[PDB]
Design a protein around this ligand. Structure first.
Ligand SMILES: Nc1ccnc(=O)[nH]1
Ligand SMILES: Nc1ccnc(=O)[nH]1
Ligand SMILES: Nc1ccnc(=O)[nH]1
Ligand SMILES: Nc1ccnc(=O)[nH]1
Ligand SMILES: Nc1ccnc(=O)[nH]1
Ligand SMILES: Nc1ccnc(=O)[nH]1
Ligand SMILES: [Cl-]
Ligand SMILES: [Cl-]
Ligand SMILES: [Mg+2]
Ligand SMILES: [Mg+2]
Ligand SMILES: [Mg+2]
Ligand SMILES: [Mg+2]
Ligand SMILES: [Mg+2]
Ligand SMILES: [Mg+2]
Ligand SMILES: [Mg+2]
Ligand code: NA
Ligand code: NA
Ligand code: NA
Lengths: 251, 252, 252, 251, 252, 251
């Protein structure tokens, strides 16, 4: 059995029912090498796929690319090949003053500022994680020594106007998004990223377990350019955490 | 010193309470209060019956909401004006999944916003989700009771009849929006219908208040067989014992 | 035959009534019923208190709705199942036009649908409008009482607080949708805010039921946000006199 | 001094504060001639304008054309010239089986299946007549001896798909409108026409008094295209009614 | 053999025409027809004046639409019933960009759907775009006339006044939706406002009909100068010369 | 200057003001090698960037990844670095029986079944190409000897439910998209892809020139699995066409 984009077969996954799904293809090997017997399976487009073993059980690691549309393809095709649980790891920009660079966030629900979520459920449906996955992610994050925040994430189909960035080619933000960062701040929203609304809505409406954990790389109330050593430490911690969360899900 | 407009209570009446248990039915308020220590009647106006009690030495409010988001929104707002920050919704519910049995408990992880009042706090994109600590406490209390507990999505409707795709009605009509909707939600894994959680969860999650919802299952629309009086009585009693234990877990 | 699910009454209990007066507050049910002949208590459950009475020799029902469209929709549906076809709503309201005074009466000619339950009966395009006969009877009854009467559009909100653009609240915030909305409605000639007419009028106008709404003004929102208590009793008393006389005109 | 489209001045109206607004420019003179001293004022595009006198008071008669957009121009420009009350007469298709050709409908509210109404008020706002105008129209219609219905009207920006007609070039109706006639019928809606949502919303949100009376020329439970044999008498009856309603509105 | 309900013409009346030129103003119909061979008046009913003529030996229809999408939609449908497949809209227009000068021509490449009738043919997601051959023919005809031609997006409004963000009106009010909208469109590069293209282009593009729009600019919302009478006369004449030449290119 | 995702500077582009933007990073080198002096600039995530020279002028080639979100980042960042004209090439699935595998499509407008377009303009705004770019693409495609179709494209945030595919993990399509392929077919829509609505809306509302040309790899009325030699030939012709369209756009 084959799929249209990922370039892997059911047999290639060696019975895996859990996937770790970072955004960046270059991070796939970095996650896989935290586990046993990592093996490269395929690379096509933004999709790099490895298998590995965790406590004797097969796990797949597959990049999503940026955004809900490319994420939706990876999740669907992995589900066709038997995957049922999806652990998203990535980076994020915090919007609350009390959330520091280097902290971790586990999303309890997403503001659906995307389009692909609507291809699975109407807007009324909540973009919420599986409770076991969120619970595992919180525990793994705390156990790493991180400062961890549970809360709502704004999930945008753009990096620029949908996150109310003005330092752009046009310097304009469409009416819908003018004032939106302050609005989300006042509503207690923690952070922005670009895939969770799609992932969580798709999975919660399709009988798949999903959750999202992220390391804070910037705070929008502070500066846009991360410090390199701090960012490296955050990224390394994030992938250690997601692997430990996977271990908890497989127990 | 103010007395809130609908609930008819003052901040002093609450004796420092920062947590409320919020059932729908005014007649259930005294029953819940009497599970705790030193229950005291505070007021009854309209659908709002208000008691205070003590739980491990700390003051707790019990306040009914009435049916629906609009009346719930008033109770939550007025209690928040008087210092309440945590809201635990309890009740009983039907279920729409064949695997969910009478006597099981549901703790809502998110709600389908089939209401109107949620939109008065946040646009539709915003998730109707509980506070994680409250949901965690509710799951623990429910599981410790010995019940089978389901974590998942609840469809929260502004109507009992067409928004829950009921056809046994005066007109027998369901508007286009809701035709086929029960099967749609079933296929999406939604556990149950109720009528307040979308408003409650959206209001609180967007206003700096902690909220969650737990419910005992008293009927299942997919199932033919009828539950006996004993099982229903036990389920109602367990639901309120569970919410009180969840309140205990929330106390600091 | 059947007992309806929430109201706890049967068709036989209504003694042939085809008209209901539907106040919000359960405590006001007896007060309306006693303005008519042979009032009898039928049932009380949750926010629903139900009496029967007789008006010019014809049976009438008085049934509270609770606050908001969701609880109203249940009462209207269940009364319609038992043969009620005409629904007269009485309540209180906040005026938003400077010339409308406390104690005046408003008869709604159409409602701004700032609710959710109306959408469970008809899409947003559908007008939340009263039955013309009911509105005509309410105008006449209100005028014949010596009241100052206004006919016009009502903004009907699922919340008391943000959807009526109140800021003296726990968060002190109003969601984008509702920021500037009071001024917008004022400029459009809207008379008043309340919380049930959009649901009631849309439900009934799309379901073969006759409905209308009359309300007593208890606050002018150009003046302040929270209603005064000193003028509320007199306003409430005249309102219920008016609705009973409107019912008499409908039974003729 | 002279409004942009209608080609008349305030002085031309001789103090009129009430207008009768039929759709067809050819019916303007007919309505004006039911009153005293009719005077032709202007004709441009779909806008033919007369004045006349009714019980000694100046009245305007001004055609609207078909649809909310052209209606909105006429109402605005008449309002700029001092008109405050607008009485709309036209033809309509009934959708209830009991409503017959030649009956008269007075709209109590309109289903807003237009676009121009949204240029005055958001969709939540009711497309409702002024109560005094509706009262006058009911009284005039009933006093005439006509069979009169009060109720909801579906007001469509199209004659064809928005009234769920299939005897058309494509023979198709967009998803929104598929099954719509039966839905409106089940909801008790009386009839279809094409201007009331715009007129009533515009006026109710702008401090103008408006209402609509219509003569039934077809029953849509019977067929799609109106029979010609009964057009003339229905139209004649309708305009006598609207003139009597105008008489009732004069102060 | 039928006579269409509004236009009052039969298929035989059109003498095989498969292309129509569709101005807004009935008085412009004869003026366009006389640029062609053997013009003949067919009918005038309401805002619909219909002529036939011959262009390079092929029959052409000229039919006015009236103002707005609703009346336009009737004319297009009824002509399509009688075999017309290509529709060329002409007129004159204002502009909202400083670089678009009086006497210039605009050929619409897409329309902002600020109408209602387009939604009766396709949901809002669908693009209001012309047939590429028609747009290409219109550009060429416009260039060949010596005019400066602009290709771009047109904002197509169901109103002349608030939907074009005009405040010089009876109320002086523009609903929230349209407040700030002219600057919004200007900053997005939109060239002009008119009142029929969104309906026409959406209807035709979703119905297997070829359509496009060309216009003369009669006002610029950004220039204080008042255009000279001769310039306006020249522009009107040029616009209809251009649309006839575009029809010639479509028939070749 | 520098950008957040693409890893290139303005200097790296050597004055280029036109970009060719395929979806698949592997296609970038292929396109660049059709031109003179191709130079690899960077590869990060789904973004591979080359420069080349066409008739002596610098051209950039930059992949977008799948979907509007990742496309929107590339377009913004290239615009920050001076690019003003964007020529999209890719593959597509036809939905019309008369549009054969191997044909080419030049989009005249897109059905906005995405989310990112709404981050630039409200839904009313048309997802429309620049007329010069569309003209150049039609000319290049026809001059190649291809069979070329001009028309409307449905641009979806998903490959699966938003293109009404049922051979999936759940086998379900959300109500919004049930019956949608037939609806688009009846409306004359030619094809499905996943980036044009975002690209065209973004550019048309931001002062950037854009257009889209695509080779038909599948017909949804036929089979899902393409024949390899046919697909190879279609892909090769598509990139030759887009380079010739670029030549036509140079000033
Ligand atoms: N600010 C941001 C940092 C990382 N990812 C985002 O989507 N946004
Ligand atoms: N079926 C239901 C039982 C209880 N509450 C509801 O809202 N629905
Ligand atoms: N201001 C108000 C008074 C009474 N009822 C309302 O809903 N609002
Ligand atoms: N059926 C109809 C007759 C007259 N006017 C309409 O809009 N519809
Ligand atoms: N400003 C305008 C001139 C002509 N037509 C319009 O619709 N708008
Ligand atoms: N069927 C398809 C082929 C290629 N791309 C798409 O989005 N769809
Ligand atoms: Cl007051
Ligand atoms: Cl008939
Ligand atoms: Mg700090
Ligand atoms: Mg800090
Ligand atoms: Mg704002
Ligand atoms: Mg009491
Ligand atoms: Mg919170
Ligand atoms: Mg405060
Ligand atoms: Mg073939
Ligand atoms: Na991507
Ligand atoms: Na209630
Ligand atoms: Na017209």
């Amino acid at each position: 059995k084959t799929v249209f984009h990922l370039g892997v077969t059911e047999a290639d996954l060696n019975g895996a029912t859990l996937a770790i799904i970072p955004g960046d293809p270059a991070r796939v090997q970095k996650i896989a090498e935290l586990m046993d017997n990592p093996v490269f399976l395929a690379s096509h487009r933004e999709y790099t796929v490895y298998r590995a073993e965790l406590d004797g059980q097969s796990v797949v690691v597959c990049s999503t690319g940026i955004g809900g549309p490319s994420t939706s393809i990876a999740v669907e095709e992995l589900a066709q090949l038997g995957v049922r649980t999806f652990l998203r790891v990535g980076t994020t920009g915090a919007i609350q003053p009390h959330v520091n660079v280097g902290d971790m966030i586990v999303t309890t629900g997403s503001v659906r500022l995307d389009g692909a979520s609507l291809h699975f459920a109407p807007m009324e449906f909540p973009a919420v994680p599986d409770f076991d996955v969120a619970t595992a992610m919180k525990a793994a994050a705390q156990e790493s020594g991180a400062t961890v925040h549970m809360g709502v994430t704004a999930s945008s189909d753009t990096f620029y106007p949908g996150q109310e960035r003005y330092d752009t080619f046009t310097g304009r933000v469409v009416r819908r998004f003018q004032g939106s960062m302050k609005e989300w701040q006042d509503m207690g929203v923690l952070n922005f990223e670009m895939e969770s609304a799609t992932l969580l809505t798709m999975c919660a409406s399709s009988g798949l377990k999903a959750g999202c954990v992220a390391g804070v790389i910037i705070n929008r109330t502070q500066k846009e350019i991360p410090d390199h050593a701090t960012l490296k430490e955050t990224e390394a911690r994030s992938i250690k955490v997601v692997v430990e969360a996977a271990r908890k899900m497989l127990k």
